Design a protein around this ligand. Structure first.
Ligand SMILES: Nc1ncnc2c1ncn2[C@@H]1O[C@H](COP(=O)(O)OP(=O)(O)CP(=O)(O)O)[C@@H](O)[C@H]1O
Ligand SMILES: [Mg+2]
Length: 376
């Protein structure tokens, strides 16, 4: 559960501890439903001690032990999760060939392919509900201190009741074909700081979630499809952003833009995203106002106010002092603007460089708070 110790960096141990070894005789492989990286994927039935329908991921013959470890490690990770919007693991087969990962059956398959199949056949409210489910799954993952690093519509599965669940777990996931090498990551879904500095956090997952929102509201359009990967690199590094989908509520596109904030600290947390989507869903009239859709627009020009002290500290990469600011009562912004350099020093900022950085930032923050701009 959340808060308990996790095993995200030891695949074999996670397989031993958090997966159920299933006897091959209890598995019935039926039709082929897809092709994974490590082998074919089948639909089948599993007998437990009544038969239940399941998805069966197999490991190709002639595999290397490294591929076997990476394959079963996904199940080792999946077995630690229990949530409505996270793909559920039934078990594994590691003792006998072929290696198998057995999960719940998701009849409608990948979300992007599903939405392209059902182009325009859902209401806006239903799409928002799909996004809310994905966001709830991601909130659970963030609360489990698990960074997905590869959140995308193609990695969201849909069952016969249209429940959307996050899938695709593991560690060294350079395997996906969309990722391309740089400085191997799916650049069209990856936050700027994660492409430049490989800083993968839940905030970069929030960026990816904004991209997923775009994918859902467009019914599976490829992000930046007009642009090459190099042009996408320039676009994201310079502040260009995707335009609004057609028939997209203004609040949803604004949420997208919030997920795409250049500074990761300003992006909302997944808990905030779930709450926001819940509020929109309970008052569906809030979804009637649409963002201006221009079919000729393919990309938005770069865009040109802190709520928490932690947001401002992470802005200047001084988050390591955040706890020290709260513990001394400096919990508001209009209270940190009333700080002297000695107050900064006593709460535990000793390095002169950090003192200088914080002081220079406080000057600009005082400028911000005292700004007046009221149109007459
Ligand atoms: N639980 C499930 N229910 C129904 N179909 C499933 C399924 N799991 C996988 N599939 C099908 O198999 C396809 C690929 O599966 P999967 O994504 O797990 O392989 P993979 O993770 O190795 C690709 P990548 O490495 O690029 O992320 C999916 O597109 C999907 O159609
Ligand atoms: Mg996978």
């Amino acid at each position: 559960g959340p808060g308990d110790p996790h095993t995200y960096e030891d695949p074999n141990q996670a397989v031993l501890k958090f997966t159920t070894e299933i006897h091959p005789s209890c598995v019935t492989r039926q039709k082929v439903i897809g092709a994974g990286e490590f082998g074919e994927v089948y639909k089948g039935m599993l007998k437990t001690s009544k038969e239940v329908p399941v998805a069966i991921k197999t490991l190709k013959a002639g595999y290397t032990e490294k591929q076997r470890v990476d394959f079963l490690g996904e199940a080792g990770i999946m077995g630690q999760f229990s949530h409505h919007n996270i793909i559920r693991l039934e078990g594994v087969i590691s003792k006998y060939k072929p290696m198998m990962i057995i999960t719940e059956y998701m009849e409608n398959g990948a979300l992007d392919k599903f939405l392209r199949e059902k182009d325009g056949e859902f209401s806006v409210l239903q799409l928002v509900g799909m996004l809310r489910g994905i966001a709830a799954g991601m909130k659970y993952l963030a609360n489990m201190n698990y960074v997905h690093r590869d959140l995308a519509a193609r990695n969201i599965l849909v069952n016969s009741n249209l429940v959307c669940k996050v899938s695709d777990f593991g560690l060294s996931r350079v395997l996906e074909d969309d990722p391309e090498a740089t400085y191997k990551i799916p650049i069209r879904w990856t936050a700027p700081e994660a492409i430049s500095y490989r800083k993968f956090t839940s905030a970069s997952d929030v960026w990816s979630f904004g991209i997923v929102m775009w994918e859902v509201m467009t019914y599976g359009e490829r992000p930046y499809w007009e642009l090459s990967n190099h042009e996408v690199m320039k676009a994201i590094n310079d502040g260009f952003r995707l335009p609004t989908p057609m028939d997209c509520p203004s609040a949803i596109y604004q949420l997208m833009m919030q997920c795409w904030q250049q500074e990761r600290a300003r992006r909302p947390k997944f808990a905030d995203i779930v709450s926001i989507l819940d509020k929109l869903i309970r008052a569906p009239d809030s979804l009637k106002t649409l963002a201006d859709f221009d079919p000729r627009v393919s990309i938005r020009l770069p865009s040109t106010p802190f709520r928490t002290v932690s947001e401002w500290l992470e802005s200047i990469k001084m988050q390591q002092y955040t706890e020290h600011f709260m513990a001394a009562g400096y919990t508001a912004i209009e209270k940190v603007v009333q700080m002297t350099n000695d107050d900064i020093k006593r709460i535990g900022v000793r390095l002169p460089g950090h003192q200088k950085r914080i002081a220079y930032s406080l000057l600009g923050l005082k400028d911000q708070v005292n700004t007046v701009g009221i149109p007459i």
